[PDB]
Amino acid sequence: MKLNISYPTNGTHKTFKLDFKAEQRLYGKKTLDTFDGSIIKPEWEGLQFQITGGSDVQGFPMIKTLLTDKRKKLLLKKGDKGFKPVNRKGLRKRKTVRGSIIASDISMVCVSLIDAKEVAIEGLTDVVVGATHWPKRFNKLKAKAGFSEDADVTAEQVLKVIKDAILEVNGGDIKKLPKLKVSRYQTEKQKERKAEKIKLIEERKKKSEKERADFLKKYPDWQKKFATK
């Protein structure tokens, strides 16, 4: 049996083999259970872990809401874990899955360490990493731009963030400089187009409203002439 450990403060991962006695002490648990590291290893006292998921040795996934030690077949839609539909909308299919309760069937258990405390777990504690992408949306970007509850042109914040990258990362360089872009804030091309719609409605009104009066000048007896079919 493998054990796969994630440390979400650091963004780091490690896999280990268990021994028999360690394994046998996990039996009976389920996803979203917790335990103390001392039950897996000597030391590791007070490290609290939470169980995330895993896999049958046949390869079927453990599902978070099927509380049994057995395999079932379920009918699954899009948005259900264990199924990945592609080429037709409204497709639903029947697949084998395993319940959440841990036993000798399992090949791998996934686990999250909540807090490393004073301990020095190799690989988990020795590295710190960030994200992969950058906040495109304006208000998400602003919070990261350190500001809150004040008004800027986007250019200001783009300048701040770029300069800080040049300074803090490279101390000067053309490296970094990912292609920062901003959504949900009005640029000048939008100011013009948003003015134009106001021009349209104002004329369409007057033109429509004119013809009504122009008609009534000529046809006082509109209704009595028209209605006699």
């Binding site: 403060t9 979203l32 509380l67 990261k144 350190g146 803090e168 990362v169």
Partner: protein
């Protein structure tokens, strides 16, 4: 050592007692005694037999898997971890930004 867990009663079965019953549907099932096998045949629903472990769990007299209502352990905010930007520099930029924002 146990033989297993009784299908109808929910009771754990000691080694060397009880029996398996195998149906033509191809399923094999373990019973504690003749008493509970017969109650299955006569279609008595287990939840109504008040001394069973099944009934006690269903009523909530005994804590069981359904009572637990677990949720994912909540974490806290981090110093903005973003690509390239080293963790320590953001610990500094965020402060500098907070200053300028005031």
């Amino acid at each position: 050592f146990y033989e297993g867990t009784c299908v109808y009663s929910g009771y754990p079965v000691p080694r060397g007692k009880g029996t398996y019953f195998v149906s033509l549907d191809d399923k094999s099932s373990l019973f504690f005694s003749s008493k509970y096998k017969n109650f299955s045949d006569k279609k008595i629903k287990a939840k109504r037999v008040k001394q069973t472990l099944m009934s006690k769990q269903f009523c909530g007299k005994v804590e069981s898997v359904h009572t637990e209502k677990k949720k994912k352990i909540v974490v806290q905010k981090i110093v903005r971890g973003f690509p390239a930007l080293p963790k320590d520099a953001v610990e500094k930029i965020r402060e500098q930004n907070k200053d300028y924002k005031k």
